[PDB]
Design an enzyme around this catalytic site. Structure first.
Site, PDB file in Angstrom:
ATOM      1  N   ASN A  48      37.801  34.888  42.647  1.00  0.00           N
ATOM      2  CA  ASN A  48      38.209  35.527  43.894  1.00  0.00           C
ATOM      3  C   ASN A  48      37.466  36.796  44.337  1.00  0.00           C
ATOM      4  O   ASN A  48      37.222  37.723  43.559  1.00  0.00           O
ATOM      5  CB  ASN A  48      39.727  35.745  43.866  1.00  0.00           C
ATOM      6  N   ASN A 107      41.351  31.772  51.396  1.00  0.00           N
ATOM      7  CA  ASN A 107      42.776  32.069  51.303  1.00  0.00           C
ATOM      8  C   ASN A 107      43.170  32.822  52.577  1.00  0.00           C
ATOM      9  O   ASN A 107      43.096  34.057  52.637  1.00  0.00           O
ATOM     10  CB  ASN A 107      43.035  32.948  50.076  1.00  0.00           C
ATOM     11  N   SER A 166      40.844  36.380  51.407  1.00  0.00           N
ATOM     12  CA  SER A 166      39.890  36.364  50.309  1.00  0.00           C
ATOM     13  C   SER A 166      39.370  34.940  50.150  1.00  0.00           C
ATOM     14  O   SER A 166      39.933  34.009  50.708  1.00  0.00           O
ATOM     15  CB  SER A 166      40.551  36.851  49.014  1.00  0.00           C
ATOM     16  N   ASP A 211      45.531  36.089  52.481  1.00  0.00           N
ATOM     17  CA  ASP A 211      45.075  37.446  52.213  1.00  0.00           C
ATOM     18  C   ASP A 211      43.614  37.710  52.548  1.00  0.00           C
ATOM     19  O   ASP A 211      43.070  38.747  52.178  1.00  0.00           O
ATOM     20  CB  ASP A 211      45.387  37.881  50.783  1.00  0.00           C
ATOM     21  N   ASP A 255      37.644  32.092  47.138  1.00  0.00           N
ATOM     22  CA  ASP A 255      37.403  31.725  45.736  1.00  0.00           C
ATOM     23  C   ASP A 255      36.042  31.057  45.718  1.00  0.00           C
ATOM     24  O   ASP A 255      35.790  30.160  46.507  1.00  0.00           O
ATOM     25  CB  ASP A 255      38.450  30.720  45.264  1.00  0.00           C
ATOM     26  N   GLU A 274      39.789  23.960  38.452  1.00  0.00           N
ATOM     27  CA  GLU A 274      39.442  24.887  39.514  1.00  0.00           C
ATOM     28  C   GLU A 274      38.529  24.300  40.581  1.00  0.00           C
ATOM     29  O   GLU A 274      38.795  24.430  41.777  1.00  0.00           O
ATOM     30  CB  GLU A 274      38.822  26.173  38.965  1.00  0.00           C
TER      31      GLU A 274
END
Length: 130
Positions: free
Chosen positions: A60, A46, A51, A49, A53, A35
């Site tokens: 998220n 992102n 969002s 959308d 992380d 990750e």
């Protein structure tokens, strides 16, 4: 902070992650590895959308933490996403535990499915004394 492998393994073990909801420490290590590369400061926006992380586990903003700029998002961990960017991973661990208390468990992170599921993950904890 960029954790070293075994340093992170013991840190996670002390935080009660070894076998949390049936997930072994090596699985958690494999997740953090893929990750963020064990980087607590890592963030990935992102654009698709809107969002982001956050942290070592790349949690998220749509559902787990509040960053105030993600549309119709929620805050399941009841933390500011800022809390997931600390060198101290206690809050990120508490949130990671919250994620896996849901039906999917460890499968919540698609990277775990791609890189850890049905794989020999022993190498992640070898020689760490955990």
């Amino acid at each position: 902070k960029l954790f070293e492998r075994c340093e992170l393994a013991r840190t996670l073990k002390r935080l009660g992650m070894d076998g949390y909801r049936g997930i072994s420490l090596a699985n958690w290590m494999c997740l953090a590895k893929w990750e963020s590369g064990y980087n607590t400061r890592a963030t990935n926006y992102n654009a698709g959308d809107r969002s982001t992380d956050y942290g070592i586990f790349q949690i998220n903003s749509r559902y787990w933490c509040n960053d105030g700029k993600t549309p119709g998002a929620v805050n399941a961990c009841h933390l500011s996403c800022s809390a997931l960017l600390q060198d101290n991973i206690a809050d990120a661990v508490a949130c990671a535990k919250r994620v896996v208390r849901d039906p999917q468990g460890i499968r919540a992170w698609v990277a775990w499915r791609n890189r850890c599921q049905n794989r020999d993950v022993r190498q992640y904890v070898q020689g760490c004394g955990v």
